Design an enzyme around this catalytic site. Structure first.
Site, PDB file in Angstrom:
ATOM      1  N   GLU A  35      -5.686   6.905 -12.127  1.00  0.00           N
ATOM      2  CA  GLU A  35      -4.719   5.858 -12.426  1.00  0.00           C
ATOM      3  C   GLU A  35      -3.325   6.441 -12.586  1.00  0.00           C
ATOM      4  OE1 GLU A  35      -4.760   2.703 -12.418  1.00  0.00           O
ATOM      5  OE2 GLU A  35      -6.882   2.199 -12.320  1.00  0.00           O
ATOM      6  N   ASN A  46       3.447  -4.061  -9.399  1.00  0.00           N
ATOM      7  CA  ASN A  46       2.600  -4.606  -8.385  1.00  0.00           C
ATOM      8  C   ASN A  46       3.119  -5.885  -7.788  1.00  0.00           C
ATOM      9  OD1 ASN A  46       0.995  -2.534  -9.915  1.00  0.00           O
ATOM     10  ND2 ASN A  46      -0.192  -4.307 -10.829  1.00  0.00           N
ATOM     11  N   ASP A  48       2.651  -9.186  -7.754  1.00  0.00           N
ATOM     12  CA  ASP A  48       3.001 -10.415  -8.470  1.00  0.00           C
ATOM     13  C   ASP A  48       4.210 -10.243  -9.403  1.00  0.00           C
ATOM     14  OD1 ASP A  48       1.864  -8.848 -10.411  1.00  0.00           O
ATOM     15  OD2 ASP A  48       0.438 -10.354 -11.130  1.00  0.00           O
ATOM     16  N   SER A  50       4.321  -8.037 -11.866  1.00  0.00           N
ATOM     17  CA  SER A  50       3.876  -7.324 -13.055  1.00  0.00           C
ATOM     18  C   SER A  50       3.978  -5.817 -12.836  1.00  0.00           C
ATOM     19  CB  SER A  50       2.446  -7.709 -13.409  1.00  0.00           C
ATOM     20  OG  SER A  50       1.569  -7.366 -12.350  1.00  0.00           O
ATOM     21  N   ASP A  52       2.259  -1.888 -14.118  1.00  0.00           N
ATOM     22  CA  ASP A  52       1.206  -1.129 -14.801  1.00  0.00           C
ATOM     23  C   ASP A  52       1.828   0.029 -15.584  1.00  0.00           C
ATOM     24  OD1 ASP A  52      -0.701  -2.788 -13.517  1.00  0.00           O
ATOM     25  OD2 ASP A  52      -0.648  -1.489 -11.752  1.00  0.00           O
ATOM     26  N   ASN A  59      -1.728  -3.410 -17.385  1.00  0.00           N
ATOM     27  CA  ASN A  59      -0.885  -4.366 -16.677  1.00  0.00           C
ATOM     28  C   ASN A  59      -0.202  -5.371 -17.600  1.00  0.00           C
ATOM     29  OD1 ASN A  59       0.238  -6.309 -15.001  1.00  0.00           O
ATOM     30  ND2 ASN A  59      -1.667  -6.840 -13.952  1.00  0.00           N
TER      31      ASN A  59
HETATM   32 CL   LIG Z   1      -5.641  -2.670 -16.574  1.00  0.00          CL
END
Ligand SMILES: [Cl-]
Length: 129
Positions: A35, A46, A48, A50, A52, A59
């Site tokens: 990750e 990302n 949309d 949002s 991370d 998120n």
């Molecule tokens: Cl997550």
């Protein structure tokens, strides 16, 4: 802060992630690896809108507030910036809520695609725990 593999394993165990909801410690270290490359400051936008955040790429759509994800939620009741700290307490506590929401660790796409079904114990091998 970029964690060492065993340094992170130790930190996660101390915060009670080993076998949390049945997920052995190696799952969490594997997930953090893919990750965020063990980097607490990692961020990724990302589609949309949002973002991370942190070592477990939590998120903003659901789990934290970053002030720029309209119509989102803040289920961990934290500023997303808190997830970028060198202390992973916030990320781990939030992770505990996520893995508890019914979908387990499938919530982390990297875990699903790169850790699930593999020898995840290998991620904590050689570590003093
Ligand atoms: Cl997550």
């Amino acid at each position: 802060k970029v964690f060492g593999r065993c340094e992170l394993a130790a930190a996660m165990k101390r915060h009670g992630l080993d076998n949390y909801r049945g997920y052995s410690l190696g799952n969490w270290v594997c997930a953090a690896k893919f990750e965020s490359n063990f980097n607490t400051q990692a961020t990724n936008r990302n589609t949309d809108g949002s973002t991370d955040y942190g070592i477990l790429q939590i998120n903003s759509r659901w789990w934290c507030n970053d002030g720029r994800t309209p119509g989102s939620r803040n289920l961990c009741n934290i500023p997303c910036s808190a997830l970028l700290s060198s202390d992973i307490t916030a990320s781990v506590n939030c992770a505990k809520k996520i893995v508890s929401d019914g979908n387990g660790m499938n919530a982390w796409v990297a875990w699903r695609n790169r850790c699930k079904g593999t020898d995840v114990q290998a991620w904590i091998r050689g570590c003093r725990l």
